[model samples]
Target chain A: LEPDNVPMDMSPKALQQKIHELEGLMMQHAQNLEFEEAAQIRDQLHQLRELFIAAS
Target chain B: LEPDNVPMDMSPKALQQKIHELEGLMMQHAQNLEFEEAAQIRDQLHQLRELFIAAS
Candidate 1:
């Protein structure tokens, strides 16, 4: 939302919060026993982790 | 408890192994609007966690 727009959050806590949201999402699909969906979320989490490393 | 009528004799390791399973299972039930079962599971987790804290 920020990157294509005004760049407000600056990608620090931005990534942090996104990771948190993903964790809960993964948990939800996990609760539903939806591993395929959870796998997608997990891949996204790894991607975010990579982004974090790049930014750091 | 045991999966069947036979008791395998649950130990500390057994408890540790099932906590993660219980967490996801309860979450799925909770997602399905099974509040009663979810509440029971959550209270059990709280009690187990409390046991750890009490030991500490």
Candidate 2:
């Protein structure tokens, strides 16, 4: 997801790390049966993807 | 998961649905591995149980 504050300068590894962190969030939410919240998180994840794409 | 706005008079089905919605949120958080946030949602679910008990 588009972070409130994206690092102006971040390494590819750092970006990947952030993605991992977000994915973890989505998984945890799904585990608890929080479908709505999970959906919201998915939105965030999508935004993050956009950010990553822009950076490349 | 006591709702922010509990209907003044809701049927059992409605109450159940609300609870389900909250549970969904928790599950979603779990899916994403947002441990900290999941814990918080659990607390909400606990509160919701209390609210239901009080209503009955």
Candidate 3:
């Protein structure tokens, strides 16, 4: 399925992409069992999610 | 080399991720020369870059 592409400044898609990239890094580190680094990413992802969702 | 992974909630890293992802999409579109969409993404990337740098 094609994902909706929103204008970047509008923030939805941009934020979504931010969340995904963070998760990608988090996953990369998690795969290596680097929980300290992964945990940091995870926490940031959580914060971004909340901020984006709240802003929506 | 392992990238210096930092705390997630730190807006700099998160914003960098956002800028990176926007560039990824923008590049994908630019590869196909869809400048309209790519321009939009480019604008977003610029905004993100500034926000990230300013916050530092």
Candidate 4:
């Protein structure tokens, strides 16, 4: 998983990919019944999605 | 935003709405430059989305 860092300049596509990756991780955690960890990943994905929206 | 809980029985629609609400909050936090809070909301949204997928 990518580290969370908000920069004034970051590509939207980069964030998009990170969100996608986080989605996968979230799913895996949920499958393992690790809702807490899955929830955390979701938050990271959401932040990346917001960055994607802002960058675009 | 709805509470994070995985019940054996929960409608997909309810989870979907929760995810939507979380998305809005995520955007709001990002707009405010509150990435950490925004990220947390995103995680909840993602978890809900996963449950929605599983339910469907």
Q: Is candidate 1 or candidate 2 better by lDDT?
A: 2
Q: What is the interface RMSD of each candidate, in Å?
A: 8.5, 7.6, 14.6, 9.2
Per-residue alpha-carbon lDDT of candidate 1 for residues B1-56, written as tens digits (9 for 90 to 100): 65644755344555555666666666665455343345366656656765643443
- Model 1 ranges with Cα > 4 A deviation: A1-11, B1-56
Worst 10 residues of 2 chain B by lDDT: B27-36
- For candidate 4, write residues A6-45 as lDDT tens digits: 4443556766777888777655544443435455665677
- Model 2 CA lDDT for position A1: 71
Which stretches of candidate 2 lie above 4 Å from their native place?
Answer: A1-11, A33-44, B1-48
lDDT for each of the candidates? Answer: 0.60, 0.62, 0.60, 0.61
Question: Runs in model 3 with CA error above 4 Å?
Answer: A1-56, B1-11
What is the alpha-carbon lDDT for the whole of candidate 3? 0.60
**Which has the higher TM-score value, candidate number 1 or candidate number 2?**
2
Lowest summed lDDT over 10 consecutive residues: which window, candidate 1 chain A?
Answer: A30-39
Task: Candidate 2: give the TM-score of chain A.
Answer: 0.56
Q: How large a fraction of the reference contact set does each model reproduce? A: 0.12, 0.54, 0.00, 0.00
lDDT of 3 by residue, B1-56 (tens): 43545434456566777777876675454334333334466457667776885875
Best by TM-score: 2
